[PDB]
Coordinates of C-alpha atoms and ligand atoms in Angstrom, one line a residue:
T1 CA -20.4 -17.6 -39.3
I2 CA -20.7 -18.1 -35.6
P3 CA -18.6 -21.1 -34.2
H4 CA -20.7 -23.7 -32.4
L5 CA -19.0 -25.2 -29.4
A6 CA -20.0 -28.1 -27.1
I7 CA -18.2 -26.7 -24.0
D8 CA -20.4 -26.8 -21.0
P9 CA -19.2 -23.8 -18.9
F10 CA -21.4 -25.1 -16.0
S11 CA -19.9 -28.6 -15.7
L12 CA -17.7 -29.8 -12.9
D13 CA -14.9 -30.5 -15.4
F14 CA -15.1 -26.8 -16.5
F15 CA -15.2 -25.5 -12.9
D16 CA -12.2 -27.7 -12.0
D17 CA -10.0 -26.0 -14.6
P18 CA -11.8 -23.4 -16.7
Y19 CA -8.8 -21.6 -18.2
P20 CA -7.9 -23.9 -21.1
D21 CA -11.6 -24.0 -22.2
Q22 CA -11.8 -20.2 -21.7
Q23 CA -9.0 -19.7 -24.2
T24 CA -10.8 -22.0 -26.6
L25 CA -13.9 -19.8 -26.2
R26 CA -11.9 -16.6 -26.8
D27 CA -9.9 -17.9 -29.7
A28 CA -12.9 -19.5 -31.4
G29 CA -14.2 -16.0 -32.2
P30 CA -15.7 -12.8 -30.7
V31 CA -19.1 -14.4 -30.5
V32 CA -19.7 -18.1 -30.0
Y33 CA -22.8 -20.3 -29.7
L34 CA -23.0 -22.8 -26.9
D35 CA -25.0 -25.8 -28.2
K36 CA -25.3 -27.3 -24.8
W37 CA -27.6 -24.6 -23.5
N38 CA -28.6 -22.7 -26.7
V39 CA -27.1 -19.4 -25.7
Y40 CA -24.6 -17.0 -27.3
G41 CA -21.2 -16.6 -25.6
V42 CA -18.6 -13.8 -25.4
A43 CA -15.3 -14.5 -23.7
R44 CA -13.0 -11.7 -24.9
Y45 CA -12.6 -8.4 -22.9
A46 CA -13.8 -6.2 -25.8
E47 CA -17.1 -8.0 -26.4
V48 CA -17.8 -8.6 -22.7
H49 CA -17.2 -4.9 -22.0
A50 CA -19.4 -3.9 -24.9
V51 CA -22.3 -6.1 -23.7
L52 CA -22.0 -4.7 -20.1
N53 CA -22.1 -1.1 -21.4
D54 CA -25.2 -1.6 -23.6
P55 CA -28.0 -2.2 -21.2
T56 CA -30.6 -1.0 -23.7
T57 CA -29.8 -3.9 -26.1
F58 CA -28.5 -6.4 -23.6
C59 CA -31.0 -6.0 -20.8
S60 CA -31.1 -7.6 -17.3
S61 CA -34.8 -7.4 -16.5
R62 CA -35.4 -10.7 -18.4
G63 CA -33.0 -12.4 -15.9
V64 CA -29.2 -12.3 -15.5
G65 CA -29.2 -16.1 -15.4
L66 CA -30.0 -18.7 -18.0
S67 CA -33.7 -18.5 -17.3
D68 CA -35.7 -16.0 -19.4
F69 CA -38.2 -14.3 -17.1
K70 CA -40.4 -13.7 -20.2
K71 CA -40.6 -17.4 -20.6
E72 CA -40.2 -19.0 -17.2
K73 CA -41.2 -18.1 -13.6
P74 CA -38.3 -16.7 -11.6
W75 CA -37.5 -19.0 -8.6
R76 CA -37.8 -15.8 -6.4
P77 CA -39.2 -12.3 -6.9
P78 CA -36.9 -10.5 -9.3
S79 CA -34.2 -8.2 -7.8
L80 CA -35.2 -4.6 -8.0
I81 CA -31.7 -3.6 -9.0
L82 CA -29.8 -6.5 -10.4
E83 CA -32.7 -7.8 -12.6
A84 CA -34.0 -4.4 -13.6
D85 CA -33.2 -2.0 -16.5
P86 CA -33.3 1.8 -16.6
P87 CA -35.3 3.8 -15.7
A88 CA -36.8 1.3 -13.2
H89 CA -33.2 0.4 -12.1
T90 CA -32.1 4.0 -11.7
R91 CA -33.6 5.1 -8.4
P92 CA -33.1 1.9 -6.4
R93 CA -29.5 2.0 -7.7
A94 CA -29.2 5.5 -6.3
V95 CA -30.5 4.4 -2.8
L96 CA -28.0 1.5 -2.6
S97 CA -25.3 3.9 -3.8
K98 CA -26.0 6.3 -1.0
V99 CA -26.3 3.6 1.6
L100 CA -23.0 2.0 0.5
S101 CA -21.6 5.5 -0.1
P102 CA -18.0 6.9 0.5
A103 CA -19.3 8.7 3.6
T104 CA -20.6 5.4 4.9
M105 CA -17.2 3.7 4.4
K106 CA -15.7 6.3 6.7
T107 CA -18.1 5.3 9.5
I108 CA -17.1 1.6 9.4
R109 CA -13.5 1.5 8.3
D110 CA -12.0 1.7 11.8
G111 CA -14.2 -1.1 13.0
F112 CA -13.6 -3.2 9.9
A113 CA -9.8 -2.7 10.1
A114 CA -9.6 -3.4 13.8
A115 CA -11.6 -6.7 13.4
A116 CA -9.3 -7.6 10.5
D117 CA -6.2 -7.2 12.7
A118 CA -7.8 -9.0 15.6
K119 CA -8.6 -12.0 13.3
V120 CA -5.1 -12.3 11.9
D121 CA -3.7 -12.1 15.4
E122 CA -6.1 -14.9 16.5
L123 CA -5.0 -17.0 13.5
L124 CA -1.3 -16.5 14.3
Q125 CA -1.9 -18.1 17.7
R126 CA -3.2 -21.3 15.9
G127 CA -0.5 -21.3 13.2
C128 CA -2.1 -24.0 11.0
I129 CA -5.6 -22.7 9.9
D130 CA -8.1 -23.0 7.1
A131 CA -7.7 -19.8 5.2
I132 CA -11.3 -20.2 3.9
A133 CA -13.3 -21.1 7.0
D134 CA -11.1 -19.3 9.6
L135 CA -10.2 -16.3 7.5
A136 CA -12.0 -15.9 4.1
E137 CA -15.3 -16.8 5.7
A138 CA -14.8 -15.9 9.4
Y139 CA -13.8 -12.3 8.9
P140 CA -16.6 -11.0 6.6
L141 CA -19.1 -12.9 8.8
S142 CA -17.8 -11.0 11.8
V143 CA -18.2 -7.5 10.2
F144 CA -20.7 -7.5 7.4
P145 CA -23.8 -9.0 9.2
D146 CA -23.2 -6.6 12.1
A147 CA -22.8 -3.7 9.5
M148 CA -26.1 -4.9 8.0
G149 CA -27.8 -4.7 11.3
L150 CA -28.7 -8.4 11.4
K151 CA -29.5 -10.2 14.6
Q152 CA -27.2 -13.0 15.8
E153 CA -29.8 -15.7 15.3
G154 CA -29.9 -17.5 12.0
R155 CA -26.6 -16.1 10.5
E156 CA -25.8 -19.7 9.4
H157 CA -28.3 -19.2 6.6
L158 CA -26.4 -16.3 5.0
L159 CA -23.8 -18.2 3.1
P160 CA -26.1 -21.1 2.1
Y161 CA -28.6 -18.5 0.7
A162 CA -25.8 -16.7 -1.2
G163 CA -24.6 -20.0 -2.8
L164 CA -28.2 -20.8 -3.7
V165 CA -28.7 -17.5 -5.5
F166 CA -25.6 -17.9 -7.6
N167 CA -26.4 -21.5 -8.3
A168 CA -29.8 -20.5 -9.5
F169 CA -28.3 -18.2 -12.1
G170 CA -27.0 -21.3 -13.8
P171 CA -28.7 -23.8 -16.1
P172 CA -31.1 -26.4 -14.8
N173 CA -28.2 -28.8 -14.0
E174 CA -28.0 -30.8 -10.7
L175 CA -26.2 -27.9 -9.0
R176 CA -29.1 -25.5 -9.5
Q177 CA -32.0 -27.9 -8.8
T178 CA -30.3 -29.4 -5.7
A179 CA -29.8 -25.8 -4.3
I180 CA -33.4 -24.8 -5.0
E181 CA -34.5 -28.1 -3.4
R182 CA -32.8 -27.2 -0.1
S183 CA -33.8 -23.5 -0.3
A184 CA -36.9 -23.3 1.9
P185 CA -35.2 -22.5 5.3
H186 CA -32.7 -20.1 3.8
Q187 CA -35.4 -18.2 1.9
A188 CA -37.5 -17.9 5.0
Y189 CA -34.7 -16.5 7.1
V190 CA -33.5 -14.0 4.5
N191 CA -37.0 -12.7 3.7
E192 CA -37.8 -12.2 7.4
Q193 CA -34.6 -10.2 8.1
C194 CA -35.5 -7.9 5.3
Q195 CA -38.4 -6.5 7.3
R196 CA -37.7 -3.1 9.0
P197 CA -38.3 -4.3 12.6
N198 CA -35.6 -6.9 12.3
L199 CA -32.9 -4.6 11.3
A200 CA -30.7 -2.8 13.9
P201 CA -30.6 1.0 13.7
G202 CA -27.6 2.5 12.0
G203 CA -27.0 -0.5 9.9
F204 CA -27.3 -0.8 6.1
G205 CA -30.7 -2.5 6.3
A206 CA -32.3 0.2 8.5
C207 CA -30.7 2.9 6.3
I208 CA -32.3 1.3 3.3
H209 CA -35.7 1.5 5.0
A210 CA -35.0 5.1 6.0
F211 CA -34.6 6.0 2.3
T212 CA -38.3 5.2 1.6
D213 CA -39.5 8.8 2.0
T214 CA -37.3 10.5 -0.6
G215 CA -39.4 9.3 -3.6
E216 CA -36.6 7.0 -4.9
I217 CA -38.0 3.8 -3.3
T218 CA -41.3 3.0 -1.6
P219 CA -41.7 1.1 1.8
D220 CA -42.9 -2.0 -0.1
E221 CA -39.7 -1.9 -2.2
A222 CA -37.4 -1.7 0.8
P223 CA -37.3 -5.4 1.8
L224 CA -36.2 -6.4 -1.7
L225 CA -33.3 -4.0 -1.6
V226 CA -32.2 -5.4 1.7
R227 CA -32.5 -8.9 0.1
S228 CA -30.0 -7.7 -2.5
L229 CA -27.3 -7.1 0.2
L230 CA -28.2 -10.6 1.6
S231 CA -27.9 -12.3 -1.8
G232 CA -24.7 -11.0 -3.4
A233 CA -22.3 -9.5 -1.0
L234 CA -20.8 -12.2 1.4
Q235 CA -19.8 -15.2 -0.7
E236 CA -18.1 -13.3 -3.5
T237 CA -16.2 -11.2 -1.0
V238 CA -15.3 -14.4 0.8
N239 CA -14.2 -15.9 -2.5
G240 CA -12.2 -12.7 -3.3
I241 CA -10.4 -12.7 0.1
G242 CA -9.9 -16.4 -0.1
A243 CA -8.4 -15.9 -3.6
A244 CA -6.0 -13.2 -2.3
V245 CA -4.7 -15.5 0.4
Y246 CA -4.4 -18.3 -2.2
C247 CA -2.4 -16.0 -4.5
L248 CA -0.2 -14.7 -1.7
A249 CA 0.6 -18.4 -0.9
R250 CA 1.2 -19.4 -4.5
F251 CA 3.2 -16.2 -5.4
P252 CA 5.5 -15.7 -2.4
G253 CA 7.3 -12.9 -4.2
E254 CA 4.0 -10.9 -4.2
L255 CA 3.6 -11.5 -0.5
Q256 CA 7.1 -10.2 0.1
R257 CA 6.4 -7.1 -2.0
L258 CA 3.1 -6.6 0.0
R259 CA 5.0 -6.9 3.3
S260 CA 7.5 -4.2 2.2
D261 CA 4.7 -1.8 1.2
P262 CA 1.4 -2.5 3.0
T263 CA -0.3 0.3 1.1
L264 CA -0.4 -2.1 -1.8
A265 CA -3.1 -4.0 0.0
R266 CA -6.0 -2.4 -1.8
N267 CA -4.5 -3.1 -5.2
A268 CA -3.5 -6.6 -4.0
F269 CA -7.1 -7.3 -3.4
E270 CA -8.2 -5.7 -6.7
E271 CA -5.8 -7.9 -8.6
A272 CA -7.1 -10.9 -6.7
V273 CA -10.6 -10.0 -7.9
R274 CA -9.2 -9.8 -11.5
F275 CA -7.1 -12.9 -11.1
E276 CA -9.9 -15.1 -9.7
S277 CA -13.1 -13.2 -10.7
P278 CA -15.3 -14.6 -7.9
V279 CA -18.3 -13.9 -10.2
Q280 CA -17.3 -15.8 -13.3
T281 CA -20.3 -15.4 -15.5
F282 CA -23.5 -13.4 -16.0
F283 CA -26.3 -13.4 -18.6
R284 CA -27.9 -10.7 -20.6
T285 CA -30.9 -10.9 -22.9
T286 CA -31.1 -9.2 -26.3
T287 CA -34.1 -6.8 -26.6
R288 CA -33.6 -6.5 -30.4
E289 CA -31.6 -7.9 -33.3
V290 CA -28.0 -6.7 -32.7
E291 CA -24.6 -7.0 -34.5
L292 CA -21.7 -7.7 -32.2
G293 CA -18.3 -8.9 -33.3
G294 CA -19.6 -9.5 -36.8
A295 CA -22.4 -11.8 -35.6
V296 CA -26.1 -11.0 -35.9
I297 CA -27.9 -12.0 -32.6
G298 CA -31.7 -12.1 -32.8
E299 CA -34.1 -10.7 -30.3
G300 CA -34.8 -12.5 -27.1
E301 CA -31.5 -14.4 -27.0
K302 CA -29.5 -15.1 -23.9
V303 CA -25.9 -13.9 -24.1
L304 CA -23.4 -15.4 -21.6
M305 CA -20.6 -13.1 -20.5
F306 CA -17.4 -14.8 -19.3
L307 CA -16.2 -12.1 -16.8
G308 CA -13.3 -14.3 -15.6
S309 CA -12.2 -14.9 -19.1
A310 CA -12.4 -11.2 -20.0
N311 CA -10.1 -10.6 -17.0
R312 CA -7.5 -13.1 -18.5
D313 CA -7.8 -12.1 -22.1
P314 CA -4.2 -11.5 -23.5
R315 CA -5.7 -9.1 -26.0
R316 CA -6.2 -6.8 -23.0
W317 CA -3.9 -7.9 -20.1
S318 CA -0.2 -8.5 -20.2
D319 CA 0.7 -11.8 -18.6
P320 CA -2.9 -12.4 -17.5
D321 CA -2.0 -15.6 -15.7
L322 CA 0.3 -13.8 -13.3
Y323 CA -0.8 -12.3 -10.0
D324 CA 0.7 -8.9 -9.9
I325 CA -0.1 -6.6 -7.0
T326 CA 1.2 -3.6 -8.9
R327 CA -0.7 -4.2 -12.1
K328 CA -2.9 -1.4 -13.4
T329 CA -6.2 -3.2 -12.7
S330 CA -8.3 -0.3 -13.9
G331 CA -10.9 -1.6 -16.4
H332 CA -11.3 -5.2 -15.2
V333 CA -14.9 -6.6 -15.1
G334 CA -14.7 -8.5 -11.8
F335 CA -17.2 -6.0 -10.5
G336 CA -19.0 -5.6 -13.8
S337 CA -19.1 -2.5 -15.9
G338 CA -21.6 0.2 -16.6
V339 CA -25.0 0.9 -15.0
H340 CA -24.9 -2.4 -13.1
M341 CA -21.3 -2.2 -11.9
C342 CA -21.2 -3.6 -8.3
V343 CA -22.8 -1.0 -6.1
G344 CA -21.3 -2.6 -3.1
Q345 CA -17.7 -2.6 -4.5
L346 CA -16.6 -0.1 -1.8
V347 CA -17.6 -2.5 1.0
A348 CA -15.9 -5.4 -0.7
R349 CA -12.7 -3.4 -1.4
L350 CA -12.7 -2.1 2.2
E351 CA -13.1 -5.7 3.6
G352 CA -10.4 -6.9 1.3
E353 CA -8.0 -4.1 1.8
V354 CA -7.9 -4.1 5.6
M355 CA -7.5 -7.9 5.7
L356 CA -4.6 -7.8 3.3
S357 CA -3.2 -4.9 5.3
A358 CA -3.4 -7.0 8.5
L359 CA -1.7 -9.9 6.7
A360 CA 1.0 -7.6 5.2
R361 CA 1.9 -6.2 8.7
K362 CA 1.6 -9.4 10.8
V363 CA 2.4 -12.4 8.6
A364 CA 5.9 -13.3 7.2
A365 CA 4.9 -16.3 5.1
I366 CA 1.8 -18.3 4.0
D367 CA 2.5 -21.9 3.2
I368 CA -0.1 -24.4 1.9
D369 CA 0.2 -27.5 4.2
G370 CA -2.9 -29.5 3.2
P371 CA -5.2 -30.6 0.4
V372 CA -6.8 -27.7 -1.3
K373 CA -10.5 -28.2 -2.1
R374 CA -12.6 -26.2 -4.6
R375 CA -16.3 -25.3 -4.0
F376 CA -18.3 -25.8 -7.2
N377 CA -21.0 -23.2 -8.1
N378 CA -22.8 -22.4 -11.3
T379 CA -21.7 -18.7 -11.1
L380 CA -19.0 -18.4 -8.3
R381 CA -15.4 -19.5 -8.3
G382 CA -13.9 -20.0 -4.9
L383 CA -12.2 -22.5 -2.6
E384 CA -13.9 -24.9 -0.2
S385 CA -10.8 -25.3 2.0
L386 CA -7.3 -23.7 2.0
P387 CA -5.1 -25.3 4.7
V388 CA -2.3 -22.8 5.3
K389 CA 0.5 -22.3 7.8
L390 CA 0.9 -18.7 9.0
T391 CA 4.4 -17.6 10.0
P392 CA 4.3 -14.5 12.2
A393 CA 6.3 -11.6 10.9
Ligands
HEM401 C1 -15.3 -9.4 -4.4 C2 -16.5 -8.9 -4.1 C3 -17.6 -8.8 -5.1 C4 -17.7 -9.1 -6.4 C5 -16.6 -9.9 -7.3 C6 -19.0 -8.7 -7.0 C7 -19.4 -8.9 -8.3 C8 -20.5 -8.2 -8.9 C9 -20.7 -8.0 -10.3 C10 -19.9 -8.6 -11.4 C11 -21.8 -7.3 -10.4 C12 -22.5 -6.9 -11.8 C13 -23.8 -7.7 -12.0 C14 -24.3 -7.5 -13.4 O1 -23.6 -6.7 -14.2 O2 -25.3 -8.0 -13.8 C15 -22.3 -7.0 -9.1 C16 -23.5 -6.2 -8.8 C17 -23.9 -6.0 -7.5 N1 -23.3 -6.2 -6.4 FE1 -21.5 -7.1 -6.2 N2 -19.7 -8.1 -6.0 C18 -18.9 -8.1 -4.8 C19 -19.2 -7.5 -3.6 C20 -20.5 -7.0 -3.3 C21 -20.8 -6.4 -2.0 C22 -19.8 -6.3 -0.8 C23 -22.1 -5.9 -2.1 C24 -23.0 -5.2 -1.1 C25 -22.5 -4.8 0.1 C26 -22.6 -6.2 -3.5 C27 -23.8 -5.9 -4.0 C28 -24.1 -5.8 -5.3 C29 -25.4 -5.4 -5.9 C30 -26.6 -4.9 -5.1 C31 -25.3 -5.5 -7.2 C32 -26.3 -5.1 -8.2 C33 -25.9 -3.7 -8.7 C34 -26.8 -3.3 -9.9 O3 -27.5 -4.1 -10.5 O4 -26.6 -2.1 -10.3 N3 -21.5 -6.8 -4.1 N4 -21.5 -7.5 -8.2
E5X402 O1 -29.9 -7.9 -6.2 C1 -29.4 -9.0 -5.9 O2 -30.1 -9.8 -5.1 C2 -28.0 -9.4 -6.4 C3 -27.6 -10.7 -6.3 C4 -26.4 -11.1 -6.8 C5 -25.5 -10.1 -7.3 C6 -24.1 -10.4 -7.8 O3 -23.2 -9.6 -7.2 C7 -25.9 -8.8 -7.3 C8 -27.2 -8.4 -6.8
CL403 CL1 -35.8 -15.4 -1.6

């Protein structure tokens, strides 16, 4: 009843151009079986949204990667929020929700927006830049580690550790084992900065440690929650911002609309998150026998959700291949959906909005003037290099 496909969604050929294979996954049926890795797969919006909103049946405590924690040892101590289910997930989620709260965005927005404008002005003085290294990477690295309260030393480990984490979500291919092989220095840095004495006061990290006396988290749980913000926060935001610049360069009409109405910046970033889906895939594990899309999935089975394919499903999105900054993006699963929906989505949207606002007000045109290079990751989609020319407005 379930179609069996030999597509490896973790191969270099797939990462190079995933969209033809993603249609094959969607059109094959609501639930497919991937013979290459012995997992179930869902690529349509309806089933992906269903799995995300049923954490009782499709749990995360057995790992959101290919590895089943009930069967294999996790390469690192499990995340207290990402790899946890209710009720254990509830209170650590509430702490991160209050640390990355709306009231916290008001305290950092002016500094984030000013740094976004200062970066664009600096890039306009060079003209020909790398929109990845000099914009997509350079701007979040200039606001987020400071907002975290991290010291200046060792910040070169942040992005390598982020790519290691998302590579480790994948199957035991060469991408994952090479990353884990080179992991020792990045792990040592990240784990050390999670300790309270190493976090500057007022930052996100110190605020997490300050939440240890409410009864929601304990002091021994605080370093792991800080590790969450050092694992998944930078690279996907970089990939999202880098995707927006990419889209604005490939769809010059949308850049012209954004220039005419800079208030579209927040939705221009949200649509970039839907269009690119920096987090392409995540796993869930069935805690019981479940029927989904007419298929009976046994207990203890890994289910692979194609978030990027769910964001391009024509059963849900009109013209899903088109970057539209005025599209009603409400409902996309680029940040997940349900109890695990990205708790740091306000930080990412703020970083993305003020950067696109700075571009909308200062840049007249973005023209690719060099070889575009893609960075391959088991979980993340993003560019390695985006050589662009920036014309001042
Ligand atoms: C474009 C930017 C981002 C994207 C695309 C993204 C993507 C995602 C997705 C899809 C999930 C759901 C995981 C799941 O359902 O298993 C998630 C969860 C999470 N994200 Fe993000 N994220 C982004 C930015 C951030 C930022 C800026 C932070 C922190 C400052 C952050 C921290 C987290 C945490 C802690 C979780 C776990 C939440 C939970 O398990 O309840 N992310 N992210
Ligand atoms: O808890 C974590 O370490 C963690 C890691 C990666 C993600 C993906 O956004 C979310 C949370
Ligand atoms: Cl670690």
